[PDB]
């Protein structure tokens, strides 16, 4: 647990750490890392997702890691192909950086 890890690239300050017992545990945040404090309005996200081709979970008959599962905030939305997964992940990033909040964290775990 106490090891510095590459997953903290810019979230936890590597150098800043107390020396002794708390080392690796009592971390500190990178000075530009801002922790979210309110909800993002993701109610409109399914609408654009359905246009892209995210087939709703009620009418798809899909299961398994063999297909990509598109989920929002902890609830299943749809099931799509992997290539479609890459396309919609990058496209959603394009739209959000360019309706869609700026805190919409998008994680596409590829096969």
């Amino acid at each position: 647990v106490r090891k510095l890890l590459p997953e903290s690239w810019g979230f936890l300050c590597p150098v800043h750490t107390p020396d002794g017992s708390p080392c690796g545990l009592l971390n500190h945040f990178a000075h530009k890392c801002r922790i979210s404090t309110q909800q993002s309005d993701v109610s409109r996200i399914p609408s654009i997702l359905y246009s892209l081709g995210v087939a709703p979970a009620s009418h798809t008959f899909a299961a398994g890691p063999s297909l990509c599962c598109v989920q929002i905030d902890g609830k299943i939305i749809g099931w799509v192909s992997h290539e479609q997964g890459k396309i919609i992940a990058d496209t959603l990033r394009y739209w959000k950086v360019e309706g869609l909040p700026i805190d919409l964290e998008i994680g596409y775990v590829p096969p």
Binding site: R2, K3, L4, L5, P6, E7, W9, P14, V15, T17, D19, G20, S21, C23, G24
Partner: protein
Amino acid sequence: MDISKPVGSEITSVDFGILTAKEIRNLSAKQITNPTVLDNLGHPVSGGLYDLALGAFLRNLCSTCGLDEKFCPGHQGHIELPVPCYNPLFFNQLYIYLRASCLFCHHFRLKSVEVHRYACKLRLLQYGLIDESYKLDEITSSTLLNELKSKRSEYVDMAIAKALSDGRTTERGSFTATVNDERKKLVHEFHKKLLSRGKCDNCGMFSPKFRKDGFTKIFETASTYILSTEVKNILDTVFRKEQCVLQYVFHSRPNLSRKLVKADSFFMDVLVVPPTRFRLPSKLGEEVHENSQNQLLSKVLTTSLLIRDLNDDLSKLLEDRRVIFSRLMNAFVTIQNDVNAFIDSTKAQGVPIPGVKQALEKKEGLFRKHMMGKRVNYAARSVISPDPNIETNEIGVPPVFAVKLTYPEPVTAYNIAELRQAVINGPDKWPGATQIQNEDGSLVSLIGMSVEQRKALANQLLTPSSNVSTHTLNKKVYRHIKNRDVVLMNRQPTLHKASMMGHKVRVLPNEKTLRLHYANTGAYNADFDGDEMNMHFPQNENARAEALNLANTDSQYLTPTSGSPVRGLIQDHISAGVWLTSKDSFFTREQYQQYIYGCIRPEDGHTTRSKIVTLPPTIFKPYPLWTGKQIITTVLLNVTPPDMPGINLISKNKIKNEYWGKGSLENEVLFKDGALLCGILDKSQYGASKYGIVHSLHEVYGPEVAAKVLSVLGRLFTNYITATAFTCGMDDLRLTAEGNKWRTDILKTSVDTGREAAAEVTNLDKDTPADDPELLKRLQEILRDNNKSGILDAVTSSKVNAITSQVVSKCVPDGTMKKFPCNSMQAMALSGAKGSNVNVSQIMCLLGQQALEGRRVPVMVSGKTLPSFKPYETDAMAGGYVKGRFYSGIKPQEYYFHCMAGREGLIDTAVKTSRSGYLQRCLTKQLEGVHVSYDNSIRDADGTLVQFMYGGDAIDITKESHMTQFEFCLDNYYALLKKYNPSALIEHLDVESALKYSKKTLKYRKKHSKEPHYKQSVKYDPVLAKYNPAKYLGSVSENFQDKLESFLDKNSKGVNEKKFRALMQLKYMRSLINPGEAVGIIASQSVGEPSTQLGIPRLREIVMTANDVAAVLKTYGVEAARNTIVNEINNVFSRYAISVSFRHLDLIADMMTRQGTYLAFNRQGMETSTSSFMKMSYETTCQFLTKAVLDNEREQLDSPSARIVVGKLNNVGTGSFDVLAKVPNA
């Protein structure tokens, strides 16, 4: 403690016996009734927990004694328990002897033949005749059973009679570790087979099986509860029938008292309330929180009153009886649980209040917090700051400490010159007194006194006593700690004995910090970044003697871990040596004379001639010059004693012969006849290095002359650095354009290291692209496995380390813009003052590969080491190869990896001291008493011989350094011969016999050794086994004598061979460990402290938690196990390159294997030990106290742990003998 109050009686030993109810009711000053501690208005309620008669309480004269709060020791009361209840200490004993019986025959469920057999076996173990009992078992219808019992009884009585008449065992038994071990094994088998009888043998009728769900309750099944009085009566009857058989299960020494053991001991008829003095209320300003013991006793008193009332209600007389019986039973159970809580705070049912057992169990208990490690008086603590001009055997006491700390000096006819003026001074005018302890013991104070009255008191210090009874004593003055006194300086943690030394005190005038000379830095492992350490001021002359002589800083030059030195100047003085003893160092007459008088001031005794002598100038024309070599030479000539020659020595230093120019010979150091003729003083000469000049001075002129040499060398190098500086800069770190181009061109060859290494590990073609999806796929398969990546992390790491080495070799020391000795960075790195070649490599060439537990940098689940690098970046850059240097800076990714590595290092550094201290504590608790006897055989405190000869030769490792340095011994033959002076070392020593036998065995051995070791019949013992090396000259070990003979047979060179071997053998006679050395403590420290630096877990697999010792013991026996233990406990130390003397590993292995088994250093091994108090003070105090008190064990107070607990002097070193005074008259 006052020396003028003598104590005659001494506690020989103590024995752990159960207190009985009848005994308590006789001693008690009162029995307490009501569960109210104290009524309102502030007075204590008579009959309560407090009382006038349980000890004087808060300005209330004690009724029992009639003395005030200070002069009432406190008196013990008792609580009349209405019913007898279980004692939670002995519940397992009561529950084993509750079962294993027939409730009708009132015997055990075992046939009385077996019971009598075990009784006589245990009676034979009472007297130590362990093997006789094994023949007692070799004895093999009912009327013949009585004859069999009588035959066994006659056999046992006659064996006892013979052993007692043979002078083999006295009337008080012979109890030792082995007999204890066999007794424990016998009793455990006794109990294991005693429950194996489900059906009785004296009358074969079944009995119910008692089932205990938990403490305070026992249930019968054919479920049914059983009252405690029934259990008491049952076991009372059983013990009455089998008193002769349990008389030898609850005893170890002959019960000379012949007092029958009952079942009343197993039950709590009475609770005992300590005197009020031991339950005084927590007072915090206004807050008063009564004791938890008082609260528990109040609870038990409440339960007593309630159950007594229920009993009385039942006595004053159906359904009402039913409810009152249920309530009475619950009152029984609740008072049982409340008693169990008052004793133990974890068996209860209900965070819970601490119980009386909880005041002892673990650390912070009464053993490991107020008996082993106490809190001392007349001591100080502070932060250390460096201070040359302190003699390396002194410590600088601030005026604050110098006015607080005091010593009681009794006034004599010769001391009133200075103690009178100390009293005149007062408690503030240093030096001076703070108290006068009179003849009557009254401590007249001086703090609040006038100077006029102080002088008036001083004029009566040495008056005669007008008291007929105090004519022996005399007044004492508590003088301030003067300049002559001694102080025991320690710096926690005390990883080794040399960390607690004794210094002479110098009363500095200025600042509040303990000022300490630099030399002791490695000795305490201290720095000056706020390190704190403590000074202890002994209060009696006998204590001054040990720190002044035995623990004195002079006596501590060589660490017994390997006999190496851990003194020597550290950082500045080393570089001042590399410069002052250069060839370029020439000194005019004024400069040289000032340097010489700057350190060897002969007004206190720095030099041994009382008039400084000079040396002729090295260069006469044009003008008189000198050299730093001559400075060292004249310093040695002045400090060395007269009427003795100078040193002769040949050695080397760490600076090669290339760093001084072509054809140079400064790398080899030469002292000839007390003159420095070649080579530069370095870390190797003076410093933490063996066989250097200061070590040689130690070995030849003594330790005190080496201490004086260290002081003068420090002072001289300081006065030379305060007239000539030495600085590191930014140019020192630079490289020429040539060096930088070489570094860049080599590092360009690190571009394809990663791809080639990865293709190698996955076994593909070296010429495959980084984007080849096959390589990506194979790296991905390697990614999840932790060993395929392990070999992908090992081959690439070797390649990048090799490229690092190529860069370092080709760049430095060639490319550096500033060269040695101009390059102060290299000057202090090569010399050893600080850092290594790796440090200047990282500063000037590159950091290299970052190691995170043997492997490369931890990787993401994606296959990326960092977000900046592509998935499976086939480049050593992504892996953790830091090409940047601390001079040119490092990239953000390399900065991240360096942060990873540094955090890992900090984590492990935090772990190592704490993790590896438990093992040292284990060893030190076990081997605390293992010392050297006067047979030169090492044995425990009791006497169980561990080894017969220390290491096989009885050579002290602190005096073994120059025993096999024959060439050194011959070169300085005259100095050594003067130091030993065999003129007065032959009038009481035999030579001829030991030399004869040594020659005979040497000839016999040379006759042999053609054949392997098993066939080599001895026919002739080694000389040490037959002759005492400290009494017969020439009694020396085989390997030493053979190496000396080889030296004398390869080097045929006014000294002859016979005189040289006489001197060497006398030196061996003086290089023997003195009797009474805590070799166990030294071994434990020397195996634990270096273990701080496979590795420690391997130690835990060999010392603490049991190639493999088990296999070699189960196949090859016990000596093979010992050899395997030593070999494996050594080669782990070897891989860390720590020199560990085998006189420690041998002692450890021979203590572990003392029983013929693989006894590790945990509580299992400790269980087989004679003294109880050590085991109680170690851990599991409850189990060991039960085992001690059930056997009525009378431990003889020999272990170091026990003698402290009972207040007696130790059994190692200074206490290992008595002192008696001869008186003239008859």
